[model samples]
Structure formats: C-alpha cells, structure tokens
Target: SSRRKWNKTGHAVRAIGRLSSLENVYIKADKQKNGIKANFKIRHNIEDGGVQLAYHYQQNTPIGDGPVLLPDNHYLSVQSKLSKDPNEKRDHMVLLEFVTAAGITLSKGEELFTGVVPILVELDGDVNGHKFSVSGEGEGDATYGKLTLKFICTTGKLPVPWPTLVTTLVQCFSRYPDHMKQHDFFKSAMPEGYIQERTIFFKDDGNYKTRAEVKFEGDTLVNRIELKGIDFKEDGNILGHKLEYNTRDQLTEEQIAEFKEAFSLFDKDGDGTITTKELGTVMRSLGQNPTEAELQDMINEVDADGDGTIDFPEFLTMMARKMKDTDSEEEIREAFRVFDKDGNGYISAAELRHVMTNLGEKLTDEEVDEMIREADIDGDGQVNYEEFVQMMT
Candidate 1:
C-alpha cells in the first residue's frame, strides 16, 4: 500500500524571484502531515546577454509555535550566463541546507541545471539578543540536482534603531545649537538624503498597522510628513478606511505633549541649562554605554575652557565643530590618515597587523587574509587610501 498525498491547502508559502530578460520561475510548497515540500519550474527567454535571476522564499509556521517565528519572509534568485567560450562548458548548480529547531540538521542537498544557476543566500534577523545565519548550496548535473533551503531563526530581539538615532541627534544638537529647534532636529538627525513615506501593512491575523513618514524639504529648513493606515472587517468587507494628515508640521496633540515631556528630561537640573553630565546621561539612557575613557575623550574634545565640564555654550560650540568636522567624508579622511603611516596613498598588511596589535587585538595570517579580501575593496592585496577610508567610514 502507498501513502496518501495530503491536501496542499492551508499551508502558507510565498515565492519571489526575477529571471533573465524575459525568464520566469515559479515555486510552490505543499504541506504534508509531518512537514512541507516545494517544487520549482523555470522558463527562459533571451539567451545572449547572460541570464539575470533573483529568488524569494518564505514560510509561515503553525501559530503558538514561538515568537522567534517571524511573519515576514525574504527571498533571493541568481541567474547565470551560459558560457559561449569554446573552452568552457560548465553547468551551474545550487545547494541549500536547513537546520531543524532541535539543533539537528533537517535536510541537505544539491541541484544541477543548465542556464539557471544556484547561489547561496544568507538571511538573519533578531528573535530575542542572539543572532543566527542560514546558508544554502546547489550543484549542476544536466537534470535538476537536489537543492535544500534552511531557516535557522535564532532567539533575540531586533536591535533597536535608537542608538543610531540618538548619535545623529547629539551630533546635530552639538553643531547647530540654534537649529536644535524641533523642526530642524529631525532633519539633521536622520540618514543623509533621506525621504519620508507612509507605510501600511496587514497583520497575519488581518489587523491593519500604519507608519508615518517624516522627511526634510528641498534644501530648506522645512520638514515633510505623511501618514498611512488601513481598516479591517470581520466579513472581508472594508468597514472604514483610516486616514490622517501626514505632514512635517502635522502632529497630534498627544505627540506634542510627549515631545514636551522629552524636552523636560533634557533640561536636567531644571535650571533650563543642559550640562555635559546631562548629555552623557541622555546618551546612556539611549543605550550607548561609552567607557570612561571614551567619555573623557568626548569631554576633552568638547570642553573649551578645560573646566573639566561642558556648559551649555561650550557644548554648543563643540557640537558645531563636530558637525562641521565629523561629516562622513571627514571620518573617512581620518581613517585613511590613521592607516597611511608612511604618508603614502596605500596601506600594507603589516600596517594593519601593527594597528590591530596596538588596539589589543590579534589576527592569524589566515584571518588577516580574509579581512583583506573582504575589506580591501580594490582587490590589490593591499588597501589603498580610498578603499581603507570607505571600509572604516
């Protein structure tokens, strides 16, 4: 007697990919009593310009499993060009491996095919403080070779974006004290050349969520904002669509109150003056655990009168200097200067080893080689000024 094929309905799977000029691929996963399986098929179009491809994959586990199970999914696809060179005729293959939840390997295999090639895809996200990585491999052998994909979602919370945000805010407040007004503050604190957009999504359970977009105006001090959200209905019919003003100048009464609350916290000692200690406390509150040495360095840089403490005016002066001097370009320049001890335009492996040693770090020759390959962008075995600068910056 043979086992019955279970119905494939009720399984949650998502597939995304891009193929050569007009190429397309589809993959579908079916749920079984114990596990799930996927089947893939491809169609090719133009052959001349080397195939371009992308692959997307996703899976949703049964509910109540655990919080580490992410509802969102990511996918990747790789397209390879068929070699026209008479001497070369190698077919492409892809391999994938998935580790099970029990700390044991669930599956491992390779697939072989022509024109279409397989490449490793790495995915990582926070679950609860620990990080996890998943890798896949594939091979080619005329007929489709076996391929396995793995998802090893580890435990940890996603890193908070607050540190980066606070860092930018501090640098901005320091450099342009006068511009530290609420409107200009966000402008200076976000990623350079950033634009705002409203985002809306439906939860797995069908509830809707909304996010606001806050951005800067065209080289002006004005800010731009937008809002987005959705409505849900028990019967699959839209009941009410939610809408709100999304403009930089648009703020809810509640948000304005919260902003005032935050402002009070910054005005430590209540004398209406923010001191150096107050600033450090704010950074610490934001999860930046700078060492005493690092704190001293900052104090020395910002305290103009050597008073051992930074007053509001001195703090403002320091901030202005930092903004003017510590832009991304300046940071890169400093990195290059540190690495280019010979006052030349390049850095040798020996220099890297020496610097690492001075920093109380050690690297084996192989490790050093790996760093060179990964960080030395020019592929010159040595890092040029520009390459080194970009790596550090």
Candidate 2:
C-alpha cells in the first residue's frame, strides 16, 4: 500500500489493484445458480490520456469440469498496462459490475449459492493482480445487508491470494452488481508534509471453502493480515507495526557504518541534523518534492528527537525505510546494483538470482522463490526497492 519506494525507481511495474468485494447486493437466483464476477485491467489513452483501467466485468463462471474447474481462460487474455500516473493523489478507477445470471445454469454446477440468499460474500484477491490472499468472518452493517466469510488460501499453489481469488469467484453466485467505491485502508487523509500522496484507495471477508476449484502445485505463502478499520501513522522513527518494513531484527555493525555515511551527505549546514527544509531539498533530488504538509509529515516520521529536524540517526533510519527500506541490504546493494542495470528501482526474480550469483551467493529457483516470498510483501511476484532492500538487507 505504501508504494513511496517506487518514486526512487524506474518502470515496467505492472500496475494493479484489488476488486475487494461488491457489498449490498442481493443474490436471488434459485433456478440459475450463477455467481457474479468482475474483470479489471489497466488501459491507457483515456480520452487520449496516459493510463486508465477498462473494467470488462460481468463474466460467467465457465464451470466446464464438474466438481472442480480449471483456472479461468479470461485471465489468459488479461493484459494490464504498467505505465504510471504521475499524480499520487488518486490511482486509476474502473467500475466492475456483477449481476444475477438470467435463471440459467451459468456454470456446470448443478447447485451453487444457487438458492436465493441474502448472504454478503467477498473475494480477497482479484483485480489488477496485486491483491493478496486474505479471508475473514465479520458481522458488519452496510447500506445493503450482509453475512460472513473467512476463507483464505494461505499455502495453496496460487500466487498469494490467487487461490483464494479463484475459489471465491467459483463459490460466488450473484445478486446484481451495484457495488463501487474502493478505498485505501492504510490512511484516509494525506500527511501534513506530503505533497500529493499517491493514493489508490482500495480486502477480505471470511468464508471458509473460498476456493471454487483447485490449483496448488506447491506454494509457500506468508503475511496473514489483520483487517484494520483505520489508523496509520507511518510517522516518526517508529513505524506502525504494519509499516515496520524491517522487523525487530537488528542490523549488523557494518550496516550502521554505511547508513551513517549516507546520512552525512545530508548535513550541508553541518547542523548535525537536517532541518525540514534540508530534508525537502534532498527529497526533491530523489524526485519527491514535498509540500509543507508532506515535509511536516515526513518530519513526524523520523524526527526522533522531536527537534523538527532529521539528525544522523534519523537520516539513517529514514533512508533504510525510504530507500525501499533497509537491513543488511547495504551489504547486498553493492552487487544488487550491478545487475540492476537500469536500476528501474526493483528487481525481478531472475535478476535477483543473477545478483546473488555474481556475488557468489547463488540460489536455486526454490531458494529464489523463498527470497521473493520474503521480500515481495505486496505479493506481486517481483521485488520493489523496499522489498529488494528488505530481502537483501
């Protein structure tokens, strides 16, 4: 959710988002048990513009194989754009619709949530692609009625929540498709010092048996999320546990030295610490020109001393985090930077392995899988600078 690290990198990032759930819809299908689903992908040239999404939603479940269906072919045609929108305030918005099947067997399934029901269901992982596998059971009130589902496919062979995504869709039948409005759960408002926070407002309702079919050759997944209603303070030297990219894991002595050295470059005035202005100047060089609010917000992040400035220690901490985050990656960066030729800001599964090989730390595909599993926090398969920093560090 905190993609700030992308600012430090280049492109080829497959832009994505999640199609959380369509709340407040009623499923009144007895004769035709067809679940509703939506398809989403990024599309460029909106009114001759740069990038946007085209929601070709309302697809039927092709339940060809009885009992268990193969993955959808629609995704075979799924092509999403990677070009980014400069504006951080809002990501792209595409409306996906879902409705009841016209009293016909939408899928091969003889019965589905096929009966008329008012249950509210949610699919945790779907949409642009980056959605994580999440599941939960909660009783809440919406403009429409509701139910519960906490079905998560943690170790099922689908990339992260893919299994969950696949399962939810199959198990789901339909109401009508009138849900819209996705919101970012991290934080609702922009920080004081932030310029225009790139916010693509966008989870999981619990329902066991989330999988509509099956697909798990072998998988190792992580990051069980705790649904947060709200409350995010990526503010200060201390990060919210969620934002705490680097764990309580301590850093090596060698790391401190490198981070310290990087810290020194900021003190042009030699004030031992950097003022908000100095920090902003450096941020500008890094392609992040902050506004007064953004600057203050940043200060709140690492101004451990509360002097309204960034000191050496604060600088190091902030760098570790902002430079895609830190750990011993400083040790790994010397070489990671090598194969990262374009330094597009993130590392691919192949390049990561290559970097490790050149550094004589060659890893197997499985090992790399684990490595990517460790660093690719967003479940996108690739590693962003933060994740790269996270893995190497």
Candidate 3:
C-alpha cells in the first residue's frame, strides 16, 4: 500500500484568446484538504502551440478558511525539470501561466468569440410557391471558433383565382333579392355574396405582393367592402399586407340563388308561360293549400286563348311583358296575388312544406321555417300578396 499526503488548492479558469494578438490571463482557485488529486480539461481555438517562457499569470484566492492556501497575486510555475544535481533539491512543477501577447482575450463562458458569417436562403415555386431569398450576417471576435448555421423551411398552398371565385359568388346573389339592379354588386361582373377581397401586385424585381380585406355588418356577419394593396410579384415577396371587414345589410349568395331557382321552378312547362293550372301547381307545391277559386285566378291571367289550358310559350311571353312593362315591385305584387292562397300576407311553414313536396322537392322543418322567415313580410306565419311581392322584387 502506498500513501501520499499533500495540501493543494484546486482551480479552474476559462478565458478567450484573440487571433494574432496577446491575451490577458487570470487564475481562480478552490482550496481542498485530505490530499486531493487534480485533473484538468482545456478547450482552445488554437491549431498548435507548446507552453513558452515569459508568460504571466494573476491568481484569485478563494473566500473561506482552508488548510490549503492560494497566493493573492503571484502564481507558481509547475513544470518538469530537465535534470537535478545530486547536491541540490528541486521541486517538480508545471507552469499554469499562458502568454497573452499574441492573442485576444475572451470573456469566461462566451460561446462565440468571433463574428458570424452571412447566410442566404432561396425559395422557389408558383405564386404560393413563389420564390424568394433571405439572408443573415454574424459577427464575433477572433477568440470565437467554429460557426455552425441552422435552417428551417416551410411551404404553403397557393390561392385560387380571385376574379373567377368572386364572379361565381356574385351569380349566386342575383337569384334572391328581386330588387337587385344592374349597377349593383350582385351584377354579373361582381355578384353579391360574402367573400374576402384579395389584391395582387408585381414588383420590378419579380416579386409578388398580396393583400386581403373583409367587412361584416351584423355582430357576427360579414358584409360589403373593397380590398386593395396586396402587392406581390411573380416571385413571392410579401411587399404589403392588409385586411378589413364590415357588415352591410344584404342577402347571402345561397339565399339569393335559392329564391331565384324556386321562382323559376314554380313557372313549370318550360315554355316561358304560366297559366292558372301552372300557377295552382306551383302554389300547391309551395304549400299554399290553394282553393279552387285561387287556382282559377292563376289560369285566368295567363290563359291567352281562353282554351282552358295554358302553354309554355304564352306563359314566357306574358312574363317578359310583365318584366318590360311593370317594375319589379309590380311583378312581385302580381305574383303574390296569384300564389298567396291565404290573405294572411306571409307563407307558413305548413304551406311551404306542402308546396315543396308537390314539386318533388323535400325540405326539413328547419329549412321550411327558414324559407318562411326569409320570404314572409307581414309576420303572419303565412305569406300574403304584398309580402310575396316584396320577396320577388
């Protein structure tokens, strides 16, 4: 068994060295008893160099009391001796000092001591796939070593054509709201419906810019507005971004389309004609529960030949005349007079369901309620001539 005893102070110090310059060196110490062993791990941004003479070290002492002590300013050099004379006793030691004259000094615990290099990222694809570039620069001192760069990539779906989508939506609006005008948003060019407007712009550098605007009317409903300034080039580089929405009193596309289609379907026989029998069929189908007298009136209006039968061509001609001669309000009034069996001034759920069934169209109770609420003006649980006329107009 071998036993060795020594009082030593343990110390660890971290510092940076500059490129082609001298760096100041500092030492920190920790005192220990019971013959502690020392182990050291060192990291440096150097290719090669051995310990040289003329280096200096400044020591820092620990705070608490201990058997092992550290010098306040001076540091002992510990190095292997080349040889020893028999008459002389020499201590085995190594130098803990390092030269700072040729390297820069770095702060303790600093990960990067030098400047970071610049990085460039290129993107590619269609509009949404639109290509672009991104770059970044890094800087640090000579004491910094080995710069690593990381990158992340993301891809997104492209948007549909704005004109086509908007046009389609507008068409759906014209079928309802009988009062729509040619200059209105529900016109063929713009059509009325809830849609967010999008604008795109091209930059000189081949980049693309895009913007969106939306508007709503009711607390939770979207309405009318315009969108602008979405400047994007062929290559996607978001130049501008904007979005807005407001509520405008208007019918939805679905509602408009539904009303228009229902009106057309009720004018059966496809000849552009509507007779008393045809009107009766339509009213019954719409759940009017029409009486024989009511059905007779419908026939009297469109039965041009008095042949007791109405033809499709005659019905269409009459319809065209009504449109050309009378205003939308008049046409709607006339339609209501023919279709509304009850004078209650509103279409009821029961009547609507009955009419829908007769036409081979099936609707749920909820749907029936919705139709009545939308079309009935007088709130009488049944649609009267005026209420029905208003819906048509």
Candidate 4:
C-alpha cells in the first residue's frame, strides 16, 4: 500500500483578468486634414484558457475619422483555471496594435518606440476584483505619428467612479517622468481631477484644452467623462449600468395585496413575521423540499434587516423579485437537492468538495469549509435549504 499525505485538498478559486476599458486613444502624428482613419488589434496568449473581447474580430477594420470613439466591445477579458495550489498564478500578455488605412502601425515608430505595446496581467482574487492601470506614449512610423493609449484591467469588477478613474490615470502617469508634469501633453489631453459643480476645462491660456464633464440622473451619478475635444474623444465611463439597483418601493398596491396574502400563508403564527420553519413548511407544501440549511440561507436573504425573521415588507420584496424573475423557487430547490447527494437535507463540507471538484472548480477542503461558513449562517457544520438559497441568490 502506498501512503501519501501531501496535496490532499483539490482546487483553488481561479482569478480572471479583464481589460476593463481603453479610456484614451491618441494618434500623435496621424492628424490628417480629415483626421486619422485607423483600425486596432489586441492580441493575447491563446494558452490563457480564454481571452474574450467585447466585440468580434475583423482584421483591418478602420476606427473612423475625427478622433473616433470605440464601441463597448473593444474591451478584453482573460480567464483562469482551478488548480491544486492556492498560489497557482497565470500571467497574461496583451498586445495593442494600431494600424492606419495606409497599413502603417501607429503605436510604434523608428524612434525606438514599440507599436506592439505589452500589458502584463497576473491571476487575482476573482473576475475584476483587482484593478491596474496601463498607459504608453509611442512614436509612430513616417506615415503615422505618436500614439498615446490609456487602459485599465481588473481581476473581477470594474470601478465606475469619476474620481477613481481619474486617479487611475494619475497613478499610471506618475511612473513616467514626462507624464507626471502637471502641464504635460498627456495630462493636458486627459482627465486631471474630479469636480461636481460644472464642467471643468483644463487650459493653459484659456483656450479650450481638455474638458471634464459629468451627467446626473436625479440625485444619482450617471455617465461622466473627460474629452480632449468638443465630443467624446477619450476617457469616459464604460460601465455605468453596474451602479443601478432594483427599487422595491415602486411596487403597486395590487402587487402588495398579492404579496400580503402569500406572506400570511407563510406566517402561520400570524405574528407579523415568518419563521424559518414556517417558510420551510410552505416550501414543503409546494412540493419543493428544501433542507434546513438551504431554508436558513433563503431566510437570510429575505431577512434584509438581519432580524433572522422575515417581516411583511421583506416578504413583499422577495415576492416582487419572484414575480419579476422567471426562475422559480422550485428550480432552485431542485438544484440544491442535487448537491445534497446523500439526501440528508443539508450540504456538508464534504458534499461541497465533491460537487465542486466534479464541476471542475476543484475546491479544496479549505475552500469548501470557507464556502460552508459563508452559507451556514447559524454556525452549523453544514448548509441547510435556506442557506443554499441564500448562496444562490
């Protein structure tokens, strides 16, 4: 018999790297009478699991004239794989190539500048969880001029604040001596600061240089940007929709009445609150038998105020969401049941490890326990039906 003790746990959570945005694109020397017409190519390693772009690729595609704006699809993303070691890392290289209508590369020139600009990305916490800034000023060929590009990458989430984005460029520029100057051409052409009053125009002698403006929707901050020209030339918010949220207060009275009936049915005690057991009974009546752990998780969700009990308003909110969403509770219950393979009405750490490993995530015991601790709100060693529903939602 062979005895092995090392590497018992399975896989680690894989981090995904994303090129969240290409904020600015400047062709230094290609300013023709009608402006520069160009196409862009972003290349990365094929071995990095998957590198996806916001748009499909068609080589030699022109970006258009008069400082053209790129579509949302120009962004890039690269994924990672689960592995045995938590420290397992994957580095990705992104190459940005700018080409003119005349077949000249604008990002590199004969002046020791490179057009195939490289951005190195390492695997991180989650998809877009970590952020990084990338920028470069390159000289173009004889036909093309200088090329200045600014971009950002993240491990899991993309930040959408004007100040954070402005600071991102500032931090990136600080690495370069020439770009650090307050009056530098790069700084002059991009967003320098955040101001909520009115549009700010960074000028040298009062001639419209760089304009920073932000729009607002009621009291909420909306899309904002800094432009080198009158229109959106460069540096604008790419993901403002991420900031939006659901509004349960907008529900109608009819909707409220229906939700009240549903709530009363679950509130068998009629004490203006539904207990976890009461909710579980209702679920059972519906033929969707959720484990106690899963039920706890589900209760944790509707218990927005963290009282461990579902009130009328909270139940109403959940009911509103249920009406809006096509995915039924029965489906989610079925999904959780599949994970509870032993039919014990709970998802144990061992079951988590087993299922995650089979699903190719390969989560180790540590990760499995961590997941359990997250879903098991009552500090139990296992996950109940409520807990499972909470995790899913």
Could you say which candidate leads in TM-score?
Answer: 4
Model 4 has a clash total of 31
Q: For each of the candidates, give the backbone clash count.
A: 35, 35, 69, 31
* Residue 382 alpha-carbon offset, candidate 3, angstroms: 3.0
**Candidate 4: residue 194 Cα off by (Å):** 33
Query: Per-model C-alpha lDDT, please?
Result: 0.32, 0.35, 0.32, 0.38
Q: What would the TM-scores of all predictions be?
A: 0.23, 0.22, 0.24, 0.26
| Cα displacement (Å) at residue 157, model 4 | 26
* Model 1 global lDDT (CA atoms, 0 to 1): 0.32
Q: State the lDDT of candidate 1 residue by residue for 275-374, as single tens digits.
A: 4566677656543567767776777776554544443333334433545445857767866766666767777777777665543345887777787777
Model 3, 29-97: lDDT tens digits are 222321111121111111133221122211112112222222122111111111112452322111111
Question: At residue 28, what lDDT does model 1 achieve?
Answer: 26
lDDT of 2 by residue, 1-393 (tens): 347667534233432222442222122211132222333432222222333222222322222323222222211111111121245232221111122211111231212222322322233443223233433222211111112223333323323222112212211222211111111100111111001111111111112212222111122111122211112123311121111111124454456556645555555554345667876766565445789788888787766545466654455556566443353456466545654656876667787676555434447989988878787899988777666665543
Model 2: how far residue 134 lies from native, Å: 61
Winner on TM-score (3 vs 4): 4
Q: How many Å off is the CA of 202 in candidate 2?
A: 58
The most accurate candidate by lDDT is 4
Candidate 4: C-alpha RMSD after superposition: 25.0
TM-score of the candidate numbered 1?
0.23
Could you tell me which 10 consecutive residues in candidate 3 have the lowest summed lDDT? 93-102
2 or 3, greater by lDDT? 2
Q: What lDDT does candidate 2 reach at residue 2?
A: 45
